[PDB]
């Protein structure tokens, strides 16, 4: 058959080629000898500061491929627009040692990065992204606007609207415009005397960043992070969140009446705020991108995970269940009405969110879509397929193929 | 070149090194990674109608010898030695070699520790290996496969075992058994094109009944075995209602759970897989252990083209069918897995959850860092299919890699 990976989805018997990873001009972490797609960090994609400029020739050539794409993407390759600004690209390189984005295509690469991003389960609505430029921005109090205005339009109150907002690219000879935080909405980690940690173990390191910075914590287990905002050259700024910008939702049970007791709650937008953003081999290092959570994400790892809130022992002594032995299932339990709760409060709350069950059968939605539109998809299996009932969901069923493709979001190291 | 693996749950790090033994390939590349596919798309094993490569099968061979020496501490001395020299002189002159049996129970264990795709391998050490390398006919292969069965089960108490049949032979058809499983559920295809049975076992009921077996009419129907001698029709054999253990499924509260008349079968035993040792490839090795619960209360009643029962309880619960946020299935779901656990832990058959299961495996990468500092382990499969960030290995990186000793899938013989 095809010389291309032979996808194949067991609960329905069908075959597709994935032709689309051919185009992957980027090695990853596998080899013919061993397999590391498991790997969260694996170390190649990881963007490590290259300060000294690119090689003018390496980047020329990501460049080209990027408008290649563009003008493909409207069906003018090959035309006399095409080519005059292959050689605008090339001409601008050659005398400043880089070259800048048109608004279009800036947009046009956003969308595409998405698209591309293997983790992302709900790549269906890629084609729908507010995309904010914001390549003028010029100091850290005016990134602090931008990103206000951003979880504004976004948040919208409770009908979330996905968006990102790009800030100046790295240049040559400049510090970046960096955006300490990994989301824009995060809750304090409290190192505690004992050892343990009040709030989100997950935060304590930014939580201990924002303190040596000159906040002044609080000391609950939902405290809203500030902003620790960076704009070339200097150090970062804090800046605190207008508590009104931030929606909150207070989670509640349908029928389990003592679980609104329980003071839990989570904030409605998710805005990941630290990876960079790279199209035609421009990097930019401050570009918040958000969406609307899948129920699972706040229900079963940051509320349950061993290493974030860890509420699974407290809820299942709620329900009374025996935690003493592993084959009660207890913990199955005790998940699954956590995320119900989840689900019920944020529907009652009337913002938007999305269930493991709804999410995934509109990814293989999307996995049709890109099979007629690219030839494939790549797609990260361990990442897609939900932290809870996985072979339940259409998408445990289906072979995927992992690559990376660009324009994408990369992970890149932390400024401090 | 040396896997940095992490866990994230307590931030721990360590290196594999035992990667670096590995001399077969895998399908993955730098350009993209295929670790979510079941099967190759070629690394079977093409057909054996003609003698294997002097030069690679005494490669294989003498790597192998050299581990089992390793085993035994005597690494270097005269049997050692002497062993070596009998492999190279048969292969000369044969174009192959014949294993000793304490080789080939070594052999057969270090298979499954190995197998990146198994959960269990913490017992590992503890396996009943039976040789039946002396076997000539279907019906020897039958009569070992009844006592395999008979010791396995132990009256509930499951012991692990393998057993061994006649290595491939160049030029001559393979000892095979063509069943996946030595117990699996008929699939009768029913006009309307849907299925009564087991869905997944359609096939092999078919060709049961092109040899002769008289079919039932049930869903929980034992099929029959397919047993192949060497270049010869398979044989059809009933197994004993007695050999077959079977539990009834009940739930602990839900009364009319009984009802439903579910029920699965005691012992697992897969029995399509290739057994590969030194180079040596044994077609028929059927091993089995005892199961971990969502094997059967997940996957195989719950998996939409299996006995996909996930709707009829849900309505019997009593739930919000009309929509996914009600997570009507994952309610579903966990009732059946737990239905699952107390009928076998009331039938006094051995059973493991997937929590109990995963803590286990956790122990046994941590005995094989030490031991031989790394461990191949496949993620996808090790992670429960439910409760996935619910277990300890969900948050552990692993390292997926082929090494010999290992079973290995086959084309079918049909
Ligand atoms: C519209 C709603 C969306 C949903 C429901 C969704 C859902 C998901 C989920 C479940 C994850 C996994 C989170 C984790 O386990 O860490 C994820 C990862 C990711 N998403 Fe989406 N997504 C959406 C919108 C977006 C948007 C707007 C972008 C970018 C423009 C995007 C980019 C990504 C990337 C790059 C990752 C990987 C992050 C990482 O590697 O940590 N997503 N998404
Ligand atoms: C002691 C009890 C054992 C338990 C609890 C256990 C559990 C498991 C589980 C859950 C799987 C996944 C099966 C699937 O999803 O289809 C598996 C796969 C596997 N196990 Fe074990 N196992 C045990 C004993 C054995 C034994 C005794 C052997 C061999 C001597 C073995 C060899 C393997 C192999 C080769 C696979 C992969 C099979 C395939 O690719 O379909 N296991 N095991
Ligand atoms: C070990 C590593 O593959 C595991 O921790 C991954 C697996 N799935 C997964 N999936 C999502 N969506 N998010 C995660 O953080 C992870 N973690
Ligand atoms: C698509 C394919 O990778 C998926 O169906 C795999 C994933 N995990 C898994 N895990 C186990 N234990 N058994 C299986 O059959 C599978 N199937
Ligand atoms: C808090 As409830 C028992
Ligand atoms: C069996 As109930 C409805
Ligand atoms: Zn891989």
Redesign the pocket.
């Known amino acids: 058959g095809p010389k291309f990976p032979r996808v194949?989805?067991?609960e329905l018997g069908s075959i597709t080629y994935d032709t689309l990873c051919a185009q992957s001009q980027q090695d990853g972490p596998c080899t013919p000898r061993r397999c590391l797609g498991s790997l969260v960090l694996p170390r190649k994609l990881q963007t490590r500061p290259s300060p000294g400029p690119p090689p003018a020739e390496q980047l020329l050539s990501q460049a080209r491929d990027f408008i290649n794409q563009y003008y493909s993407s409207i069906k003018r390759s090959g035309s006399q627009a095409h080519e005059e600004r292959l050689q605008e690209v090339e001409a601008e390189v050659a005398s400043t040692g880089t070259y800048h984005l048109r608004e279009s295509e800036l947009v046009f690469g956003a969308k595409q990065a998405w698209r591309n991003a293997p983790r992302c389960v709900g790549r269906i609505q890629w084609g729908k992204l507010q995309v904010f430029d914001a390549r003028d921005c010029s100091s850290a109090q005016e990134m602090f606007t931008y990103i206000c205005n951003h979880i504004k339009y976004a948040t919208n109150r409770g009908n979330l609207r996905s968006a990102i907002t790009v800030f100046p690219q790295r240049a040559p000879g400049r510090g970046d415009f960096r955006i300490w935080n990994s989301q824009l909405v995060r809750y304090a980690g409290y190192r505690q005397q004992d050892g343990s940690v009040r709030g989100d173990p997950a935060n304590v390191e930014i939580t201990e960043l924002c303190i040596q910075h000159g906040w002044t914590p609080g000391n609950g287990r939902f405290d809203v992070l500030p902003l620790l905002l960076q704009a070339p050259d200097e150090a970062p700024e804090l800046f605190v969140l207008p508590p009104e910008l931030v929606l909150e939702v207070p989670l509640e049970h349908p029928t389990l009446e003592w679980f609104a007791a329980l003071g839990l709650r989570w904030y409605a937008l998710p805005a990941v705020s630290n990876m960079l953003l790279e199209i035609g081999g421009l990097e930019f290092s401050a570009a918040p991108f958000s969406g609307w959570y899948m129920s699972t994400e706040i229900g079963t790892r940051n509320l349950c995970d061993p290493h974030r809130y860890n509420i699974l022992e407290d809820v299942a002594v709620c329900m009374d269940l025996d935690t003493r032995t592993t084959s009660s299932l207890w913990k199955d339990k005790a998940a699954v009405e956590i995320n119900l709760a989840v689900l019920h409060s944020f529907q009652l709350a009337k913002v938007t969110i999305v269930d493991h069950h709804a999410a995934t059968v509109s990814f293989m939605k999307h996995l049709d879509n890109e099979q007629k539109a690219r030839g494939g998809c790549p797609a990260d299996?361990a990442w897609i397929?939900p932290p809870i009932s996985?072979?339940l969901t259409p998408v445990?069923?289906?072979?995927?193929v992992n690559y990376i493709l660009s324009p994408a979001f990369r992970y890149q190291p932390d400024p401090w």
């Open positions: 194949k989805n067991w299996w397929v996985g072979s445990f069923h289906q072979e995927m």
